Subunit: 311 residues, 5 copies
């Protein structure tokens, strides 16, 4: 079967639509997400046109093998989508209405700069390659683009599912390619990060600062060193849930900065002890009293600077 | 093959049933579970009807390709179910009795608010899309809905497997869809959480409280800081087995609250030492003696408040 | 093709056999194991019977499509088995001899009460569903039930592979079902648990008991608290290799009991220090001297009680 | 269908091309990467040649079954590629233009010597096995070799995708094999390693060196031993992300060398304490004062030597 | 299609060969490895014999369906191999030359006694089951047994790939089975274990021995207990990479023995402190001075004994 013959030198418009049924397994590290959706296709094939009076039927149902169907692919998929044809209906004017249900693992990169207070735009790229007989162009049928109400993505708020109506027409290996962009806007549910990572990390840091109210070097060493080890555990815990980025993330920035706070606290604890041994506790006391105000103030200001730079 | 022609303007009723054989791999983080079950289908096709006397046979067995079979799908599946037709029997009134054995990874969300003392309702949504010739409606044959006695779900008690008899008939992409809800009620076996997480977590917390019977700041610092690190390990252990929720879980609430108890214990340990150095041990003694009663009382009352709010 | 017509009202006996070739991947947490075996089937089809003199051949070889073959399934499988027909041989009397090689992931629950000194009975349930024309009953051909000598299951001793010769005949969805039970008896190789978990766990516990020969509260706090953290690591290590059980395991019981021993050791260490500060070291000495005998004696007796209750 | 008959004793040239669409899942430990690309093939089949005037058509489109297609395979793949034919076009002179879209898990070894400042050359080996009728040779059509702009590999910078135009023609099992080498040059994004591994590792090492400003053996023991445990955690973290190499990696060298620095710091801390107890603190002071300069100087010089040897 | 008819009562010899192309994913815990290789088969079918003069052709190429092909299987595979026929060539005398490219996950047990200085013999068992008409025997064509030069197994040195030329002919379910043994000899690249596990483990042990040059019980307790916890981390790290063995491994023996060294070091540290408190430091000094020589000497001798027993 050959594609529909053109009337004039016009290309064949294949109207598309994606209706999300299931959205799952957004792998942050792999920047992949799995989708289960309806893919609707519509085009005019004048060769399939019929008279409703003569034939008796209002619409004709065909099997995929029986008629010409456009070779529609996804750009950003790991493997070819798992699809099952639901219906093929032909109107008297030759307007074919195709519907299939598919599942695919979509590969869409994520921007972790504002993690875990980040928002993303997941993409689903529909593509058609033009044939030698005729050029094929994709279009969006806005009435057949949507999502089920029950569609949920664990740890994410699904904002919108829309399509960029004008396709990206380009040439690949001396043939026209018509690419459509389907955008699923999501925003992370940062809630859990607050009692699980952020507050426990702040608590251990604040515990290290109690060494500014102690003259016992042995106890101070235990305070700052133990809490630093807990901070290392939280840093390792955070980087397991995230991929290796060529940029600094919001959480990554905070975590890294906190290391400097532990390092300077060790220096303060060392200086205080050296001075006490040197029989200069008055100078040591001035440094410790200053540190009680300096450490929280510098921490608060540095965080304001970070939050400003990131948001 | 086209669907059965209607007598009047009535829709085609496809009687359904699901008999669970195997139930496994309930992934709490992924909110997925695997199922192996029998799917029974029954509908009337007057075109397949035949003579007992003339034909000789009581029932006719057909191969799936030979006759019209409704395109029955699952809504909440990752991929198309793995199915193998077991039997197709036609009565001579044209009543078709279809049976297939399938396996699928069902995507059903879970409510972790009361974890690990939570109960869930897993869903299996059966769906049929109406054709242009005729509208297809699903029905429940209660005699063909059940589960095997041997059906076990590791770490869960299987309560019931029932079906919501009235389908959710709606329009999707200008076509009628008949959706049925199959509900598998389960309840978590919380037993293991008590000797593995809850009691060990209480033991380390109670060990930190021994600092209220010690004047040794160095020993108290070691007691409260070490036990806090063990509590961090238990917090990390718990959040690995659970997904990131936009709400607080029962275990999550307790674990988070315990951090505040460690933080105030550090403050007490610090205050006590500062006062002793300041040659005010009488005031420090009053604070330590009060803490011996305050810490367990406030812990007990706060837990009563949490248990009340959650259950 | 229809099933063999009955002479009298007798059911069709399908003689079965399973010969294990490969046995692997016993997942303790998932209570699954993978199998690669031969499945032999034999039944009489009088319609396929022939004269050896007239036909010339002693046996006729058929392709699966050519003749009626019983729909044999496994009850406790995740998905339908991966099978490849090896041979189909028909004797002159119509006795069909079918052989296929299959692989499947069998779902069989395990009893962890005596872990790691536990033994299990893995099950493989063969099943046939009766047809409308005739009832099908399964039988065991003991000469075609066995296992290869090289069959090994990492960390397990394969004891026996036998079949319960009398089938469990029952009705499921108004049709007879003939179920056969194939039992693979295994026993865990507990050896590795001794130098890897049990002895290291005892060593750290015995190290904590050295605090009964020390008056240094600071050193005792470090001894009991550090060893308790190592015990937590061993508890976490053990529960990762095991699934969540609604009962107590042997190892689980020991591990949990050891927490109580650490808790009482902390109390002893606290009491001793409080008394010393109170200028009552004579009373503290009596308590410490008693603890030197009490702790190992109570530990030995409690373990005898546990071993008695569990074995 | 037999291959195209030769004019003279010349071999059949199959012009090839690979256009990368998706590049993902580079597993460092497994030395595997997944690819989704276009595979273009072109050869002359004089038997398929036609007159454009007589036939009417400029090009003829065939189904794969209809014509002879060369058996093209990948050398370094885990399993046979997942492919779907896109187009087969025959020119009047018999020049066949084949295009397929495929996905495969490519097995290409990596050189970790300079990790995480390493660059790699991933290989994709195309191969054709000669037939008895004729010898088949592969060629590169440089116009059909490329990559999509959006092609991204998490944690890597994609440098180039080129093909070694001259094939490696050799004999395997007494038949000619024509092998082509497609090279994907990548370079690691080392950025994240600096705030996540390198700096935290340096911070804990520098913290251990504060013991050179302390006379408190108990505090020094806590400083050097605790920081060493954190260094062990970083060593374990690094070797999980890497495979077992029969050579030393850059990061591996640094990490190993740092152990020696901790070991000598323990010796210094021990020597200092022994001398103080021996009532020789003047000699101990000379050793500690020297260590303050020796440790950072030897660390800086040793790192210069390592960086020189590795880069 | 039936097998080739015998001349005399001789069995049908199927000459085999395996040429390794890709060797990957050797899972130590699962005792599995993946293979991608060429499988060559050759047998004489007199029914396919032809005259080169009359037919014109020197060799005839057939499709697998057209002629009788022996049912060749692998014994030690997880699932049936993924195979794709490359060529089938028939010589005038009826000598068929079959070649296929396959991939399979081979299940071959490993001996960990000498780990990580162990060598293994991986097996690939080829098997053919005799038919009722004729008995089939396997043979090795040594000219078609080999491996590609580029064949690499991460963390292993590939020594040789040879075949045991004489098959293991036996009866299984009253039919002859001809089994061939293909052996891939490998030896572990132990290099990485030295700077990653062995030396760091020795360093922490040697650090614990510094307590023999200290009289500070509090510092000694910190030294021996902290290093013991690091040794536990290395023991856990080692047992994750290894399966549970009913025997002791070389590394397992060393690791276990080191626990005894830590235990006796705790006893020494305890005895020394008890004696000092008892105002007997002269006796304590004798014990500590002896331990300085005893501990390294006993460690060196015990390791010589272990190395002797294991190698
Ligand atoms: C030390 C701890 C630092 C915590 C920083 C607070 C988070 C923040 O400031 O994050 C900022 C986010 C971003 O939300 P957005 O809509 O994407 O901002 C886009 C705004 N533009 C368009 C102007 C750039 O705000 C929140 O989620 C606020 C609630 C989180 C509070 C958590 C407190 C703990
Ligand atoms: C600090 C530790 C806090 C532990 C709190 C106890 C658990 C609890 O109170 O959990 C509550 C669960 C809930 O069971 P439910 O049937 O769903 O209650 C639903 C009742 N409504 C419908 C009225 C709301 O009760 C149990 O499982 C009781 C046994 C567990 C005791 C474990 C003790 C340790
Ligand atoms: C503290 C450490 C406690 C260790 C308890 C020993 C194990 C035990 O007592 O386990 C008991 C097992 C069970 O073997 P069974 O044949 O299944 O007993 C069934 C007997 N009935 C049928 C009468 C009930 O005996 C062994 O494997 C003995 C060797 C293991 C010794 C390990 C020592 C370390
Ligand atoms: C202790 C910490 C030691 C850190 C050593 C610095 C890294 C280095 O020296 O790495 C070297 C890399 C190599 O880049 P290249 O192009 O492959 O060098 C090839 C050059 N030839 C052809 C001459 C051999 O340079 C970088 O990426 C420089 C930026 C990283 C700085 C990170 C500092 C922290
Ligand atoms: C405490 C640390 C103990 C380390 C023991 C050294 C390893 C050993 O002795 O291992 C022995 C291996 C075995 O090599 P093989 O050829 O299989 O010996 C077979 C010999 N027969 C046939 C005579 C039995 O030798 C090596 O790999 C030597 C190099 C490794 C040195 C690592 C040093 C650190
Ligand atoms: Cl696709
Ligand atoms: Cl363009
Ligand atoms: Cl074009
Ligand atoms: Cl489905
Ligand atoms: Cl099955
Ligand atoms: Cl391939
Ligand atoms: Cl096989
Ligand atoms: Na078509
Ligand atoms: Na059908
Ligand atoms: Na059949
Ligand atoms: Na072809
Ligand atoms: Na064949
Ligand atoms: Na300490």
């Amino acid at each position: 079967v050959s594609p529909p013959p053109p009337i004039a030198d016009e290309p064949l418009t294949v109207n598309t639509g994606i209706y999300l049924i299931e959205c799952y397994s957004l792998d942050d590290k792999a920047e992949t997400f799995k989708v289960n959706a309806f893919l609707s296709l519509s085009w005019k094939d004048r060769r399939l046109a019929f008279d409703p009076v003569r034939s008796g039927v209002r619409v004709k149902t065909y099997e995929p093998e029986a008629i010409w169907i456009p070779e529609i692919r996804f750009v950003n998929v790991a493997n070819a989508r798992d699809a099952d044809v639901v219906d093929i209906s032909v109107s008297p004017d030759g307007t074919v209405q195709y519907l299939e249900r598919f599942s695919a693992r979509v590969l869409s990169p994520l921007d972790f700069r504002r993690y875990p207070f980040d928002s993303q735009t997941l993409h689903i790229y529909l593509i058609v390659r033009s044939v030698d007989t005729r050029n094929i162009v994709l279009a969006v049928d806005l009435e057949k683009v949507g999502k089920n109400d029950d569609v949920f993505l664990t740890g994410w708020d699904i904002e919108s599912f829309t399509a960029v109506v004008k396709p990206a027409n380009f040439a690949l290996e001396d043939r026209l390619e018509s690419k459509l962009d389907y955008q699923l806007r999501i925003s992370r549910q940062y809630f859990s990060y607050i009692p699980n990572i952020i507050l426990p990390m702040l608590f251990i840091l604040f515990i290290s600062w109690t060494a500014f109210w102690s003259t016992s070097y042995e106890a101070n060493v235990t305070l700052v060193v133990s809490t630093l080890i807990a901070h290392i555990a939280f840093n390792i815990l955070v980087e397991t849930n995230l991929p290796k980025t060529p940029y600094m993330t919001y959480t990554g920035a905070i975590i890294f900065m906190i290391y400097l706070f532990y390092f300077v606290a060790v220096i303060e604890v060392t200086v205080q002890h050296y001075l006490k041994v040197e029989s200069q506790p008055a100078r040591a006391a001035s440094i410790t009293r200053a540190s009680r105000i300096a450490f929280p103030v510098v921490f608060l200001l540095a965080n304001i600077i970070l939050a400003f730079l990131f948001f």
